[PDB]
Amino acid sequence: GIVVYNAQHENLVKSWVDGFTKETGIKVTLRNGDDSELGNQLVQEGSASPADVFLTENSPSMVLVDNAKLFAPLDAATLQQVPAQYRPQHGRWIGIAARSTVFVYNPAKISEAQLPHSLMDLAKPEWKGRWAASPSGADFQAIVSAMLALKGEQATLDWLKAMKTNFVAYKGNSTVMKAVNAGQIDGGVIYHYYRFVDQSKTGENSKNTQLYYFKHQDPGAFVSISGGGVLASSKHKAQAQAFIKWITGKQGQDALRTNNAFEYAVGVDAASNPKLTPLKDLDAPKVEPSSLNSKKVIELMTQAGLL
């Protein structure tokens, strides 16, 4: 069978494996981990890696592995299952799901009318002590990688230095949401699905929160694309290509619509969970996935004192 380095969620991917194996008989072994962990591990393994497939929550760790020259071209028929805007132009990997940046806020701490117009506005001195984020996570680092691609090094580093003055750090994006929910800060920068996931359980970590979408092609409207790819070293290329085709195809994208992950489908003509605000109404900035640079992001955040 095939070996998948999986930095996407264990439960979502297991439902993909369930349908994929049922229809093809191809068995899948998951090696689960985080974006940056598994990305760096693949670069170190190089062509000696036992992985056939790499899946990520966000794009920068895909770019890391592609920069190392480790991905095989994806089948053209697979690439055509996803629109070009949710896909690197070079076709060596593909988007498999999406997540929207949001400002999660506590209405008892901050009225909707007081929310920042731009993610860049959180650098202003009036925001000191009033917002949070998880800078060690690949989630927030991907958001900063979009700001870097959109705004450039100097403007991004200036924003990061003001964030060091202004923000409150927490370990984990769900932790940020819990802190907002408890009223420790006015709000925080996370991805949209965390609130949906918790509301589908007890809601005890989210009931005092609401989601704000920056829109207007703001850096804060960045839509982060989860990635999938076939390793060039794979000895099971047909099976590996078929797994990517499955997860980006109608049945695989269907799971995104009906499961409890609340992440967006990216497939052509694919409906997303109806509780989500449609991606086409969010007016995300144009951000080429290959332009997202996780190494420079870590350096800038370290220069700012955040890591």
Ligand SMILES: [Fe+3]
């Ligand atoms: Fe995440």
